[PDB]
Each structure stands twice: as C-alpha cells, then as structure tokens.
Amino acid sequence: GLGEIRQSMLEASNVNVTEELVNMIEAQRVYEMNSKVISSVDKMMSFVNQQL
Amino acid sequence: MHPALWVSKTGLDAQQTNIATISNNLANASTVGYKKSRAVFEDLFYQNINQPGGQSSQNTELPSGLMLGAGSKVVATQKVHTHGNAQTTTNALDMMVEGDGFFQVTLPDGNIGYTRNGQFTLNGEGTLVTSGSGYPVEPEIVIPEDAISITVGTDGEVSVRVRGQQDNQVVGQLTITDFVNPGGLEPIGQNLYLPTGASGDPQEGVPGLDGLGEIRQSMLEASNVNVTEELVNMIEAQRVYEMNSKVISSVDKMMSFVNQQL
Amino acid sequence: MHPALWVSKTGLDAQQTNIATISNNLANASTVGYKKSRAVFEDLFYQNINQPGGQSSQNTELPSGLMLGAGSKVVATQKVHTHGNAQTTTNALDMMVEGDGFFQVTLPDGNIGYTRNGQFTLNGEGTLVTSGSGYPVEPEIVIPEDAISITVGTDGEVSVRVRGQQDNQVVGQLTITDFVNPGGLEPIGQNLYLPTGASGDPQEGVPGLDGLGEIRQSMLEASNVNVTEELVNMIEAQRVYEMNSKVISSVDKMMSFVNQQL
Amino acid sequence: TLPDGNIGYTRNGQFTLNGEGTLVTSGSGYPVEPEIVIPEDAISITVGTDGEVSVRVRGQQDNQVVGQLTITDFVNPGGLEPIGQNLYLPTGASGDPQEGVPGLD
Amino acid sequence: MHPALWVSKTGLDAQQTNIATISNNLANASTVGYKKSRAVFEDLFYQNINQPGGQSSQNTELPSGLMLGAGSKVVATQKVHTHGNAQTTTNALDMMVEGDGFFQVTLPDGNIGYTRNGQFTLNGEGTLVTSGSGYPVEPEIVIPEDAISITVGTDGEVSVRVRGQQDNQVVGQLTITDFVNPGGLEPIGQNLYLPTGASGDPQEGVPGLDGLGEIRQSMLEASNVNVTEELVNMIEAQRVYEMNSKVISSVDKMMSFVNQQL
Amino acid sequence: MHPALWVSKTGLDAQQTNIATISNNLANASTVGYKKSRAVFEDLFYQNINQPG
C-alpha cells in the first residue's frame, strides 16, 4: 500500500483558494453577528442601570 | 449561515472539478492512446418543506411542493472510450488495436496493467517492453539477435526473420484483453489501467477473434480529445463558475447590510 | 493555487519538451549519421476521489469513478534508429555501414565511443581518425607513407597499394559493434554514443558476418530526419501549446474575478 | 460509543481514524457503532449509500467490504437530551431507538 | 492584534521574496552561464492548543488536535544547476564547460572566484582574462606575441601557432574546479561564486577526467532559465499575494466593526 | 518601492544597451574597416538574507 517515488516532480499543496475565500466570507459575518448580541446586551444592561 | 451561500459553494466546487477535467484533456492532446474524460453533474438532495402530493384538504393535493435544492456536484468522471485516429509511422515495434482490446504488461508489483498505448521498444535482453517506464509485455516477446526483421500479424503472431534461413521464425503470440466496461477501469497513470469491480472480468484471447480488435504494426492510436469541444466547455464552465460567485457576492452584501441596519 | 493551473503547467512543459526535440532534429538536418528523436507522452497519476468499482450500496458498484488527472509529461525521448540515405563522395576515407553496426573510436578518457558518422581522415602519424575531434578508430588503422591508394573492402579489411608491389598490402581490419537495443545508447555529442544498462552488452565482430552490416567505402549516411514530418509536428505542438495557455489564462481570470467579487 | 459505555447519537459526520484504524469522531475521538476497522493495506475508502464500507486493495479486484454502518432514527428527535459535543442521549419522550440499514424503513 | 493579521502578513512577505526571485531570473535571461533560482516555501511552527494524540478519557485519544499554524516564509533560494543550451560562436577565446566544473579567476582580494561564464579575452600583457572587469583566469595563460592561432583542447590544454615554427607550442593548462553541491556556492555577482561550508571542498582536476566536464572552445553556455516557468510562477505569486491581502482587509474591517459596536 | 521593480529596471536598462549595440552594428554595415561589438551581460550583487552554508 505504499506509494512510489517520482523523480523530478513535486507535490503541490491541496489548498482550494476559492474555498478559503468563501469560508472567509462566512467566518467574517458570523463574527460580526456575535458582536451584535454582545452589543445588544451591553445596551440592555445600560438601560437597566438608568431605569431600575 | 445562509442557504444560498452553501448552494453556490457546491456550484463552485462542481465547476472547479469540471475545469480540472478539461485541463487534463487538453494537456493530453498528443498522448498516444489517451481516452478523454467528461465530468457528470447531478443535483444534490432536496429539502422537504412542503410535501408535493400531500393532502391539503380532501380531494385536493399539493400540485407542487416547496422543495429547496442543496446545489450540485460532479458525481463521476466518465472516460469516453471511443476509438482515436491512427498515426502512420515507420517504426516496426509500435502497434495499435484496431477495435476493442487492451495490451497487457507486467507491473513491478506483480499484477497486470492494461494499456492502449502501442509505443513499444526493446530492453537489454531484447524483451518487448513499453517505451516509457520499460514494463515487459504479457506474454513476453523476446526477439533473438539472429533476426533481421520483425513482423507482427493481424492475429498478434509475432514472427522474426532469420538470416540465412528462408522461413519466418515464430517467437511469440500477443493476446489482448477486452473489458465489457472499459470506462470502469482505474487509471493509474503511465497510460495504464487496472481492473476494478465495475470493470468486469478480463476476457483474454487471440487479437481478432471473439470480438477482439486487430493488431496493427507500424501504427499508433492518437488521443480522442476534441480540442474544439474542450475549449467550448472551458468557456461555459468559466461562466457558470462566475455565476455562483455573483450569488455569493450578493449574499455577502446582504449580510453586511443586515449587520449595519439590524 | 488551482488544480487546472498545475495541470496546464505540465501541458505547457511537455509541449516545450516536444518542440525542443523537433527543433533539435531540424538543426541537425545535415549532420552525417544523425538519428532523429521523438518525444513520448504519458499521462500522470489520477487523484482518487471516488473509487471506480467501489461498493456504493450493496449489489451495486460505481461504474465510473471520480478520478482527476494530474497532467502529462514527456516520459522518454526515443531515438529512431532507422537507416539513412547514402551519399556518394569522391573521398576514399569516408565509410558507411549498410545495416546494423557502429564504428568504434577511442575517447580521450580511454573509453570506446560508438559512432555512425563515417567522415574519417588521417593525423600526422597516419592513423585513421575521425574528421571531427580526431578520435582514433578502434582497432588502430595506420596508413604507411608509401601507400598510393587506400581501399576498404566489404568485410572491413583495410589494404593499400604500394608503388613497387603487385597485390594490395593489408594494413588492418575494421570491426563494428551492434546492440540489441540501440535506442538505449547515451548521446554524448559529436555524433558519438555510449552503451547503457538498457542498451545491452556490446558485441563486436567482422562486418558482413552474423547480422552485422557491410562497410561501404566512399559513402556517407545522411541524417534520417524528414523535415516534412518535423515541420508538421511543430505546427501541431504549437496548437496544443496554446490550448494549455488558454486554461492558464482562464484560471487566472477566474482567480482575479473572485478577488474582485468575493 | 461514549466513554461511560452508553450510545450517543450524532448528526455530525466529521469522522477520522485512530491509531488502530477504527472509524472515530473527529472531535473527542469516540468510536462509531458498529466499529469499522480500515486495514492498513487499503488505498481508498468508499462508503455505500446503505452504509456499506469498502476498501480498495492493490492486487485485488472487487474491493473488500470491511463493515456495515447503521443509523438510528427517533419518533421524536426533539425529545433527545443535548449533552454537547454534537451528541444526543435518548430520553423517555424521545422514543425507542429504531436501528436498521441506512435507506430502508 | 489578531492571529490572522500576523499569519497573512507572513504570506505577503513570502510572496514578495518569491517575486523578487522571479524578477532576477527574468532579468538575467541572456546572461551567459547564469543559473536560475527557485524559492522554497515552508510553513512556520504550529501553536498547540489541543494535543493530537493526547488521551481524551481512557481508551480514547484525540485523533486530531487543535493546532494553528503561524504562517509561512521563504526558507531558501535554490540554485538549479542544470546545464543550459550551448551557443555556437566564432570567437576562439570563449569556451564552455560541458558538464560539471567551474572556471577559476583571480579576485582582487586574492581569493579564487568560480564562473560558468566563458566569455574571455586578452589584456595588454596577453594574459587570458574575463570579458567583464578583466580578472585573470587561473592558472595563468599568457598568449605569446608570436602566435597566429589559439587552440584549447577538450582536456583543457591550450596551444598556439608561432609564426614559422611548426609543432604548435603549448602555453598552459586549464583546470576546472568541481563542487559536490554547486548550489551551496555563494553568488557574489559578476557571474562569480565563492565556496562555502555547504558547497564542499574544491575538487580541482583535468577537465574531462574524474567526473569533470570538458572544455568546449568557441562555445558558450546560455542561461538555463525557462521563461515559460518564470511568467507562470509570476501569475501564481501575484494571485496568492492578492489572496493574503484579502484576509488582512477582512481582519481590518472586522476590527473596525468591533470598535464601533463593542 | 518593491525589490522586483528595481531588479526589472536593471533588466530593462541592460537590454536597452544591448539593443543599442546591435542597432549600431546594423548602422555600420557599409563602413569600411568596421569591427562589430557584442554586449557582455553579468548579474549584479546578491542580497545575503540567509548564508548559503
């Protein structure tokens, strides 16, 4: 089950640049949306301090 | 995060694989005995929101339900095993299978690799071997150093002519193997195929009887790639690839707008 | 960065290797005893995504599996060792081999190099050497200073006619070397070859007997290049070269589009 | 198979292999029921539609089957107990686990 | 501030070094005896959050840990010492080494510089010097004022033809130095290299024995750069450079959003 | 601004001097007793980031 040795040949990386860029899009938006929850709670706690 | 983001990711993945298949065909536009490949597309599963045919009220059923798709993918790479054009050469040790059949060579591991390439040569011992890595051809054909000319018949009978002897000296008999589904063979590179479960049992025999092709000496089989087809498929794939990039871009702008507003 | 970029790079490199082979043949269109070369292509390994014949569900196996190729490369540069045309010249020191065989010369390092070029001359000491770098021919053939005519027979026997003696006076014998696979010889330049492991053991002998060719005096062997075939091959290899560049151009435009949009 | 011994049910499909070749989860490393042992002589893995696991072995046609995966459904999956790690535990209101070939019933 | 900012910044610097390497290869596309360079990419260390293989409870181990890479960098620039093409020139003072070996010149500081460039000439005193700054070639080869022709043999023996006198006079011997790893030579510009700790001990000897190359008079060694690879590598390097800028821009926009929201 | 900009500038300048030398030889194709000229190329110094050895 071992592979063979190929002279004068190099193995390129298996990264998919298009996949990484799309995953960057999703990660950025979910990162910003979690900040929305923290900001919403921060304004909620601020309103409680002024009211209660 | 958004259904249209994941659906277009599958679309981009399919078109990247489709382009890579085309790029492989155009790379092998001069390889001897290369069979072109075409990617097979199929849609993914459909999410079942509203069931088509579900009974909304008696004597009434949903004529068409709300079924959302999950995108598309490339399910298979089909080797189109149509015959390629013949190249006329002056070499006497290059052969061609006119019709169905595969040459069989002995791999170093011990198994037999099946090849459509006909470019053969001689080793130090005179055994007929492949013109690439030098694998021996099954069955072994050893040309003695008492020969002045090599002739390979249609029925695969390898005969050499001895100096000072008015008689052909038969020194071998090539046998070729056909597969019911040659597209099911596993390409292992070096113009070699290995049998698989879906390929079927190898059926070996004389090259010219029982549906086998004929051995053509001094002739080579060109690749069956159509550069006109590959380029047009290259242009179409590039546009469909850009189609799903716009959908991702629109979804990306939609989420950014919602973050700023909501 | 993109699989189609690497595959097309292999396609571009293979075509450059092919055109460089054709350009070499065209450059040596007037070399004496030159054997043309052809580039042998073969596809590289295939990435195994979906195994052909894999048991996708019971009683069913994948007919065609998703296998992506890695491109192609020139696996070998095969020397076409076919006999060339004979040139008739008034020189008495240029010989030709009618059939299989190689002239053997003494290299500066001491080894024996095999040449099909028959353009020979004499040095100051009268030894028969090549008209190139002056490598003496094995075995040494020395022409006495009293010789008025030099004749080389079919069997390679070198004899001269001396002023004051009927019948030729033998001065040496020529032996030529054959190989089971001359395509395995190593080209070391200056129309010389060296034996390799794939070429086989050298086998000497008198010319004319036991398969060896005959020494033809006042005759030269032209290069076996067919410029008509060479010119057509360059046009074909140029087209395939531009086929792969369009894929690199397409991929680059694809990556540029994603950067601008995504 | 949870460390305590009970069976946890997951919708996460990210799997890998341990040192011994058994199919496990890509996270904490729990094995998958039934155990699927991938031999070290395999060159590729194909998982069938009905959960049949096969491996391609060089020198052999007709890829060798090494195991059969089964999946569990519930009448009320919303009644499961989320214990984290993308794992659910059966409960009283979840219903009896129904196990079989992945694609029938 | 953010791990992605540092990881992507390393990628930007790596591509810039690679592009700077490509530009130098294309700049020296016509330099005689120039060897192309290739940038070797390697990843940085990996931050170990969760240990891969650490035991997650008993009879269970983490099959894959949470390991984050620190980016990438260009660790080395490799000199690809593959032989270039041979330029056929009419000048008698430009020689080329065919195979391994380097010429030896005298640096002003006293050390010996090694050059594959063969374009030589004479200075006022008749010493055979380089065609650039005029450094003498070791060992000294002083051409006598009475010479009418200069011949350099395959074994590096240099001879001249004095007027009237026969039996051409020997004026000196050319010796070429070989290194076990010529890629370890430090390039000091001016088509010169210097021996280093990794290059190996300088192996001096006759040009044509002991594995050394042979001197080819009236011949030059063109640069071995492949313009096809340089331009395609520039295409890939430019895109990956743009890819890393997208991450930094995304991180910049993410931190701007946090500052306004949090 | 960028290392490749300066490297390619030298390459552009080197080929301009080479093309100028060739164009001069073509101009003096009828000048009696003229000796042609050839440009000799050499690489510039190397920046030592990591010592090879």
3-state SS, one letter per residue, for B109-145: CCCEEEECCCEEEECCCCEEEECCCCCEEECCCECCC
Residues, chain F: 53
D30 backbone φψ class: left, alpha, beta (φ>0; ψ -120 to 50): beta
> How much is the CA Rg of chain A, to the nearest whole Å?
24
> How much is the CA Rg of chain B, to the nearest whole Å?
27
C156 backbone φψ class: left, alpha, beta (φ>0; ψ -120 to 50): left
Cα three-residue angle C30-C35-C39, rounded to 5 degrees: 115
Question: With an 8 Å Cβ cutoff, is C133 touching chain E?
Answer: yes
**Do residue F52 and residue E191 have CB atoms under 8 angstroms apart?**
no
What's the one-letter identity of residue A51? Q
Chains that touch B (3 or more CB pairs under 8 A): A, C, D
| Residue C81 near residue C41, CB atoms below 8 Å | no
| Residue C69 near residue B31, CB atoms below 8 Å | no
End-to-end distance of chain D based on CA atoms, in angstroms? 24
Neighbours of E261 (CB within 10 A): 14
Residues D52, C58: Cα–Cα separation, whole Å: 7
Cα separation values, B96 from B102, B217, C77, C206, Å: 10, 7, 20, 37
Chain centroid, CA C13 distance in Å: 21
- Cα-Cα-Cα-Cα dihedral of E105, E111, E112, E114, to 10°? -90
Cα separation values, E48 from C116, D30, E168, Å: 66, 21, 74
Of A2, C51, C45, nearest to B189 by C-alpha is C45
Of B83, B87, B115, nearest to B30 by C-alpha is B87
Query: Order of strands, edge to edge, in the sheet holding C169-173?
Result: C147-152, C157-162, C169-173
Residues B85, B93: Cα–Cα separation, whole Å: 18
Cα three-residue angle C12-B222-C230, rounded to 5 degrees: 65
E172 backbone φψ class: left, alpha, beta (φ>0; ψ -120 to 50): left
Contacts of range C142-149, beta carbons closer than 8 Å, 24 or more positions apart: C142/C171, C142/C172, C143/C171, C144/C169, C144/C171, C147/C171, C149/C92
The DSSP H or E segment spanning E220 is strand E219-221
Question: With an 8 Å Cβ cutoff, is C227 touching chain A?
Answer: no
> Cα-flanking dihedrals φ and ψ of residue D93, to 5°?
-90, -5
Chain centroid, CA B261 distance in Å: 53
**Do residue B197 and residue D63 have CB atoms under 8 angstroms apart?**
yes
Q: Measure in Å the smallest separation between the Cα of B155 and chain A Cα atoms.
A: 36
Chosen for mutation from C100, C243, C244, C251 (greatest number of chain B CBs closer than 10 Å) is C243
**Do residue B111 and residue D62 have CB atoms under 8 angstroms apart?**
no
Neighbours of F34 (CB within 10 A): 12
| Residue C74 near residue C154, CB atoms below 8 Å | no
Resolution in A: 3.0
Residue D26 tokens read as 């890509």
Residue C6 tokens read as 């690497």
DSSP state, residue D80: S
The DSSP H or E segment spanning B35 is none
| Contact pairs from chain E to chain F, CB under 8 Å | 79
Q: Which residues contact C6 (CB under 8 A, 6 or more apart)?
A: A12, C70, C71
Evaluate whether chains D and C are touching (3 or more beta carbon pairs less than 8 Å apart): yes
Q: Measure in Å the smallest separation between the Cα of A1 and chain D Cα atoms.
A: 5
Question: With an 8 Å Cβ cutoff, is C5 touching chain E?
Answer: yes
| Partner residues linked to C159 by β-bridges | C151, C170
| Residue C120 near residue C191, CB atoms below 8 Å | no
| Residue E63 near residue D20, CB atoms below 8 Å | no
Cα three-residue angle A4-C6-C230, rounded to 5 degrees: 95
| SS3 labels along chain C | CCHHHHHHHHHHHHHHHHHHHHHHHHHCCCCECCCCEEEEEEECCEEECCCCCCCCCCCCCCCCCCEEECCEEEEEEEECCCCCCEEECCCCCEEEEECCCEEEEECCCCCEEEECCCEEEECCCCEEEECCCCCEECCCCECCCCEEEEEECCCCEEEEEECCCCCCEEEEECCCEECCCHHHCEEEECCEEECCCCCCCCECCCCCCCCCCEEEECEEEECCCCHHHHHHHHHHHHHHHHHHHHHHHHHHHHHHHHHHHC
Q: Which residues contact E193 (CB under 8 A, 6 or more apart)?
A: E102, E113, E114, E115, E182, E185, E186, E187
**Do residue B184 and residue C63 have CB atoms under 8 angstroms apart?**
yes
Residues A30, B5: Cα–Cα separation, whole Å: 13
- Cα-Cα-Cα-Cα dihedral of C132, C134, C138, C144, to 10°? 120
**Do residue B77 and residue C71 have CB atoms under 8 angstroms apart?**
no
Residues D18, C187: Cα–Cα separation, whole Å: 53
What's the one-letter identity of residue C170? V
Neighbours of F33 (CB within 10 A): 5
| Residue C218 near residue C87, CB atoms below 8 Å | no
Neighbours of B22 (CB within 10 A): 29
Method in brief? cryo-EM
DSSP state, residue B94: B
Q: Which residues contact C19 (CB under 8 A, 6 or more apart)?
A: C234, C237, C238, C241
Collapsed DSSP state (helix, strand, coil) of residue E161 = strand
Q: Which residues contact E223 (CB under 8 A, 6 or more apart)?
A: E28, E29, E30, E31, E32, E33, E34, E35, E36, E84
Question: With an 8 Å Cβ cutoff, is F42 touching chain E?
Answer: yes
Question: With an 8 Å Cβ cutoff, is E1 touching chain C?
Answer: no
Question: With an 8 Å Cβ cutoff, is D38 touching chain A?
Answer: no
Question: With an 8 Å Cβ cutoff, is C55 touching chain D?
Answer: yes
Give contacts of C56 with chain D, Cβ < 8 Å: 46, 48-49
Question: With an 8 Å Cβ cutoff, is C241 touching chain A?
Answer: no
The DSSP H or E segment spanning E87 is strand E86-88
Question: With an 8 Å Cβ cutoff, is C56 touching chain D?
Answer: yes
Chains that touch F (3 or more CB pairs under 8 A): E
Of C23, C176, C194, C196, nearest to C98 by C-alpha is C176
Residues B24, B116: Cα–Cα separation, whole Å: 18
| Residue C194 near residue C188, CB atoms below 8 Å | yes
C218 backbone φψ class: left, alpha, beta (φ>0; ψ -120 to 50): left
In terms of DSSP H, where are the helices of B28-87? Answer: none
Q: Which residues contact E116 (CB under 8 A, 6 or more apart)?
A: E32, E33, E34, E35, E97, E102, E103, E191, E221
Residues B233, B243: Cα–Cα separation, whole Å: 15
Give contacts of D103 with chain C, Cβ < 8 Å: 57
| Residue B110 near residue B78, CB atoms below 8 Å | no
Cα separation values, E30 from E25, E72, E86, E221, F11, Å: 10, 32, 13, 10, 10
Give the residues after which the backbone of chain C is interrupted, taking a C-to-next-N distance over 2.5 angstroms as a break. none
What's the one-letter identity of residue B253? K
Residues C58, C70: Cα–Cα separation, whole Å: 31
Residues 171-210 of C with CB under 8 A from B: 180-181, 183-184, 197-201, 203, 210
Question: With an 8 Å Cβ cutoff, is E29 touching chain F?
Answer: yes
Q: Measure in Å the smallest separation between the Cα of C44 and chain D Cα atoms.
A: 18
Collapsed DSSP state (helix, strand, coil) of residue E250 = helix
**Do residue D58 and residue B196 have CB atoms under 8 angstroms apart?**
no
